[PDB]
DNA sequence: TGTGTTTGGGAATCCGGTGCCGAGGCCGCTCAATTGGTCGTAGACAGCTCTAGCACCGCTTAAACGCACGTACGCGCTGTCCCCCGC
């Protein structure tokens, strides 16, 4: 399954008012058996694609270093 | 979500009493500083030599300088996780 679903599912499972950090996303995907080490660069890209698709709102920071929430709009 | 100000409250500080022991003074003594004198020599001074430090010049080339260009490291920001702190 593509990493955009795994990320969206992790952000939905950890839904809050702040927003899953990249470190929490790493932890959730690793707990989901996804190798976050080798494919970290893929994650940053896929995450960026999800922000560029507007599917994730950046709530703090800039780019992948930030916190993110599912764009309910 | 943020922050100027509030206010009871522990913690450091000030003040007065007090008492106690060491610092300051006094005395008797002694031994080390002082006086005077002799004598030896350490070094102050003159004087002489020669070396090695300074100033200069010219030439070559290697290093320093300025500049273009790119990337990688420093630094700021965010997050988390845990391990020292206060009690």
Strand B CB-contacts below 7 Å: A 17-21, 23-24, 27, 60-61, 65-67
Q: Where are the domains of chain A?
A: 1-73
Distances in Å between the alpha carbon of A33 and those of A27, A42, A69, A72?
Answer: 10, 15, 22, 27
Structural method: cryo-EM
In angstroms, the CA of A65 and the C1' of B35 are apart by: 95
Q: Of all helices (H) and strands (E), which one includes residue A73? A: none
Q: What is the DSSP string of A28-68?
A: HHHHTT--TTTTHHHHHHHHHHHHHTTSEEEEESSGGGSEE
């Amino acid at each position: 399954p593509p990493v955009s679903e795994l990320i969206t599912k992790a952000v939905a499972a950890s839904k809050e008012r702040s927003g899953v950090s990249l470190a929490a996303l790493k932890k959730a995907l690793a707990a989901a058996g996804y190798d976050v080490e080798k494919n970290n660069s893929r994650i940053k890209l896929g995450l960026k694609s999800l922000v560029s698709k507007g599917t994730l709102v950046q709530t703090k920071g800039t780019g992948a270093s930030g916190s993110f929430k599912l764009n309910k709009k």
